[PDB]
Design an enzyme around this catalytic site. Structure first.
Site, PDB file in Angstrom:
ATOM      1  CG  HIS A  74      -0.747   0.458   2.303  1.00 55.40           C
ATOM      2  ND1 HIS A  74      -0.526   1.476   2.613  1.00 55.40           N
ATOM      3  CD2 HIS A  74      -0.475  -0.630   3.331  1.00 55.40           C
ATOM      4  CE1 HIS A  74       0.247   1.110   4.651  1.00 55.40           C
ATOM      5  NE2 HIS A  74       0.292  -0.443   4.488  1.00 55.40           N
TER       6      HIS A  74
ATOM      7  N   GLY B 289       2.905   6.448  10.114  1.00 56.75           N
ATOM      8  CA  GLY B 289       4.198   6.136   9.524  1.00 56.75           C
ATOM      9  C   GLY B 289       5.131   4.662  10.110  1.00 56.75           C
TER      10      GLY B 289
ATOM     11  CB  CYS C  88       2.958   1.095   6.800  1.00 57.61           C
ATOM     12  SG  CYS C  88       0.768   1.089   8.075  1.00 57.61           S
TER      13      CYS C  88
HETATM   14  N1  LIG Z   1      -7.963   2.705   4.637  1.00 57.48           N
HETATM   15  C1  LIG Z   1      -6.986   2.788   4.909  1.00 57.48           C
HETATM   16  C2  LIG Z   1      -5.708   2.118   5.044  1.00 57.48           C
HETATM   17  C3  LIG Z   1      -5.349  -0.017   4.832  1.00 57.48           C
HETATM   18  C4  LIG Z   1      -3.918   0.103   5.812  1.00 57.48           C
HETATM   19 CL1  LIG Z   1      -3.348  -1.172   4.520  1.00 57.48          CL
HETATM   20  C5  LIG Z   1      -3.296   0.970   6.390  1.00 57.48           C
HETATM   21  C6  LIG Z   1      -3.638   2.374   6.419  1.00 57.48           C
HETATM   22  C7  LIG Z   1      -2.617   2.749   7.869  1.00 57.48           C
HETATM   23  C8  LIG Z   1      -2.718   2.875   8.814  1.00 57.48           C
HETATM   24  O1  LIG Z   1      -4.289   2.285   9.519  1.00 57.48           O
HETATM   25  N2  LIG Z   1      -1.721   2.760   9.616  1.00 57.48           N
HETATM   26  C9  LIG Z   1      -1.183   2.954  10.774  1.00 57.48           C
HETATM   27  C10 LIG Z   1      -0.298   1.824  11.340  1.00 57.48           C
HETATM   28  N3  LIG Z   1       0.062   1.752  12.600  1.00 57.48           N
HETATM   29  C11 LIG Z   1      -1.247   2.836  13.156  1.00 57.48           C
HETATM   30  C12 LIG Z   1      -1.774   3.704  12.724  1.00 57.48           C
HETATM   31  C13 LIG Z   1      -2.382   4.217  14.252  1.00 57.48           C
HETATM   32  C14 LIG Z   1      -2.500   5.677  13.592  1.00 57.48           C
HETATM   33  C15 LIG Z   1      -3.022   5.747  12.027  1.00 57.48           C
HETATM   34  C16 LIG Z   1      -2.123   5.024  11.235  1.00 57.48           C
HETATM   35  C17 LIG Z   1      -1.359   4.176  11.829  1.00 57.48           C
HETATM   36  C18 LIG Z   1      -4.620   2.428   5.808  1.00 57.48           C
END
Ligand SMILES: N#Cc1cc(Cl)cc(CC(=O)Nc2cncc3ccccc23)c1
Ligand SMILES: [Cl-]
Lengths: 305, 300
Positions: free
Chosen positions: B41, B143, B145
């Site tokens: 992604h 961030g 990920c």
């Molecule tokens: N729609 C959608 C979508 C799909 C995917 Cl595979 C990944 C993301 C980003 C996402 O949630 N990563 C983040 C990772 N860890 C904690 C987080 C805490 C706050 C914010 C983001 C965070 C969004």
């Protein structure tokens, strides 16, 4: 989201762990530049440990009596001196993996990561706090002596603890990297007991702010307290006195959540007098005191090393 | 003495963390040999996350569209392929800090260390378990990920998790290092919810044996149970069914302490009924389920 007891990345410290052998005793050493630091009791036998005269035991040793091993490479000892309860072995090779470092003495309530080692080989990393009674509730087996505690500030590894012993209650005692013990402990086989422990109040408050940041607000109330009334309650529950310095350090968390430090103190006051009533805060049924206000901010901001 | 939630030394994994940038998106990558692995992604934008077509989005990219940064050195991308939900960036330099490694897919209840990273920079390490609902209760911000989960056994780093997303409940979903998600999750902004979580029964039992090894016996009772009666009581507390495989795995701990697995099950049943009555087990007022039988034998 999520709150974990998070340790600093141990990588910079792993490259410093060596195995130190003096006779039949084998413990860990910290190799920084051309010196290896380890507990001075490595020179003691079990009989010697009962009543040790370290200057007398050390004067009988030569450089070749200390076997130092950096992985599978034997380091040659070219000098040996003692600084308080730490033995300093001068070696012929400077550690090429030496990070930017400082020796710091921490105060009770301060946290640090421990890289547990056996035979100069790191086996695990964990976070812990220097208890108000100067002990650490570590996880250590025989051979763990010489394992170190540290914090990482930007790129500088501040070494703050070297493990020396386990007390009869299963808690641990050690020194700063200059060999000065934390607490009223001595490096000898004798009757030593940890004093009655207290809860680190500023850390419980910081962890309550981390719960609010993570969406756990059930414990919040409309009430506030005075700093003195809170300390009269805290003294009753074996909690450390909260000072104005603690109130100031909690300022950024107070501003981020909109809950005044004395407003959060009244939540803690109610939790102490009534309990959690079947509820948990951050997946815990006890009030956690091993996260400082800076650990809460670092974990709820994203600071990297 | 002492029992702590201990993570593996992260050193071998720190030397693999890189920053991956595709357009405006910046996440972490795992640089092993001449390959950088990161969530696919990273190629997605704003109107992409809802229903992305990764083959279509990836076909539009060239090597120079991926900026890989190992510390202060930009790595040159010379190839790119997709394996399930992982993007594999072939780079011109092999990581000299590459440890002995393997990609392993773990089962729920298994534990691992997570090296949380932001901008290819490790910020912290923690221990956690793959929940029975295939999520992890991590500590991750935006961030993070591409941050990875691993175990270290006999000098080898077994990579088992790559962080991909946070679910609406604050729990996290990710894949093994071959890009296969753990659980019924997808890398989409669709309505995804974690299933009802259960307590890892075999891990609570293992932790009860760790308490007996450390000298705590207050919770033991004169009772034993059948495996079926235990599972009928366990299901009522949202505990995972204990299988015969779990009973077998607890054998060494049972032999070391002298407490039969079904005798320890009877203590668990009683502990679930009574609670702890103001007492703690290994400094905890709750029953801990994030230590496997293997972790207990390793630490005690
Ligand atoms: N729609 C959608 C979508 C799909 C995917 Cl595979 C990944 C993301 C980003 C996402 O949630 N990563 C983040 C990772 N860890 C904690 C987080 C805490 C706050 C914010 C983001 C965070 C969004
Ligand atoms: Cl109950």
């Amino acid at each position: 989201s999520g709150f974990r007891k998070m340790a600093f990345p141990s990588g910079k410290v792993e490259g410093c762990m060596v195995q130190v052998t003096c006779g039949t005793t084998t413990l860990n050493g910290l190799w920084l530049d051309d010196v290896v630091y380890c507990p001075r009791h490595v020179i003691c036998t079990s009989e010697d440990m009962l009543n040790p005269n370290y200057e007398d035991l050390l004067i009988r040793k030569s450089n070749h009596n200390f076997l130092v091993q950096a992985g599978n490479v034997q380091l040659r000892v070219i000098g040996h001196s003692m600084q308080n309860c730490v033995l300093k072995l001068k070696v012929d090779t400077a550690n090429p993996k030496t990070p930017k470092y400082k020796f710091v003495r921490i105060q009770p309530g301060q946290t640090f990561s421990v890289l547990a080692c056996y035979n100069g080989s790191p086996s695990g990393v964990y976070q812990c706090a220097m208890r108000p009674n100067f002990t650490i509730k570590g996880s250590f087996l025989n051979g763990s002596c010489g394992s170190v505690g540290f914090n990482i500030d930007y790129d500088c590894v501040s070494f703050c603890y070297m493990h020396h012993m386990e007390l009869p209650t299963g808690v641990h005692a050690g020194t700063d990297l200059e060999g000065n013990f934390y607490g009223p402990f001595v490096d000898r086989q004798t009757a030593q007991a940890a004093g009655t422990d207290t809860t680190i109040t500023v850390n419980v408050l910081a962890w309550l702010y981390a719960a609010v940041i993570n969406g756990d607000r059930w414990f919040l109330n409309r009430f506030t307290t005075t700093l003195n009334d809170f300390n009269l309650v805290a003294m009753k529950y074996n909690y450390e006195p909260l000072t104005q310095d603690h109130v100031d350090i909690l300022g950024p968390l107070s501003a981020q959540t909109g809950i005044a430090v004395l407003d959060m103190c009244a939540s803690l006051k109610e939790l102490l007098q009534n309990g959690m009533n079947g509820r948990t805060i951050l997946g815990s049924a006890l009030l956690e005191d091993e996260f400082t206000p800076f650990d809460v901010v670092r974990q709820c901001s994203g600071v990297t090393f």
